[PDB]
Design a protein around this ligand. Structure first.
Ligand SMILES: NC(=[NH2+])c1ccc2[nH]c(-c3cccc(-c4ccccc4)c3[O-])nc2c1
Ligand SMILES: [Ca+2]
Length: 223
């Protein structure tokens, strides 16, 4: 997260870190045994880390659970990143409390102008790599489809939306991929891509979760 602030330990209880010997992506806890992340974050050997704040120190509240299976959307296209969503089933259920909690899926899509909270342990520099130890947060608004499409002509599908600042300076970045975009207490997006980080006129692009709610529900119901 570039231009964000320190969230404060366990203030974002549905945030998870996908770890394979190091933190590589974020994710959101939606129930005690399932997490949603981005399909481009897929790999084998994923350990899900819940209740984290400082990813390099065990401080208490953490729960490390291995993933039993990862389900990448069947229509995920790695070249366009259309349908960039994945579900991870945990080997065992997490113990939910006030530090580890699930986030609700939306009943409707959000509108431009809606203010959302994006969080993660991704890069904090737009020019260079500086990864933090603690969770960073950023408040950003969903942009209108015309500003999104004018920024990335030909690259936005109806399963994506832009959120951020056209002036640059604040944005999600590499390492934040897979994490949550929560607006009005509902999970509306998944950090997916962008051109660089916090560059002028190149806002972040997110997977539009409202379009996948029936899919998520059906898939969880059958696995
Ligand atoms: N400007 C942005 N809002 C933004 C957001 C997420 C990003 N994620 C990335 C990204 C860049 C390089 C590699 C990965 C990557 C690839 C495979 C696995 C994990 C991360 C990224 O997610 N750039 C990103 C840029
Ligand atoms: Ca820790």
């Amino acid at each position: 997260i570039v231009g964000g602030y320190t969230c404060g330990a366990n203030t974002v209880p549905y945030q998870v870190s996908l770890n394979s010997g190091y933190h590589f992506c974020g994710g959101s806890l939606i129930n005690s045994q399932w997490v949603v992340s981005a399909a481009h974050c897929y790999k084998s050997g994923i350990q899900v880390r819940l209740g984290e704040d400082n990813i390099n120190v065990v401080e208490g509240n953490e729960q490390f659970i291995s993933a039993s299976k990862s389900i990448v959307h069947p229509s995920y296209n790695s070249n366009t990143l259309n349908n960039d969503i994945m579900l991870i089933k945990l080997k065992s259920a997490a113990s939910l409390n006030s530090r580890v909690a699930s986030i609700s899926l939306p009943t409707s899509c959000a509108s431009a102008g809606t203010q959302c909270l994006i969080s993660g342990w991704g890069n904090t520099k737009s020019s260079g790599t500086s990864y933090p130890d603690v969770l960073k947060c950023l408040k950003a608004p969903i942009l209108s489809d015309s500003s999104c499409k004018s920024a990335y002509p030909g690259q936005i599908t109806s399963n994506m939306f832009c959120a951020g600042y056209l002036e640059g300076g604040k944005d999600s970045c590499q390492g934040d991929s897979g994490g949550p975009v929560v607006c009005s207490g509902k999970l509306q997006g998944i950090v997916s891509w962008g051109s660089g980080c916090a560059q002028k006129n190149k806002p972040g692009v997110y997977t539009k979760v409202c379009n996948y709610v029936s899919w998520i529900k059906q898939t969880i119901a059958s696995n």
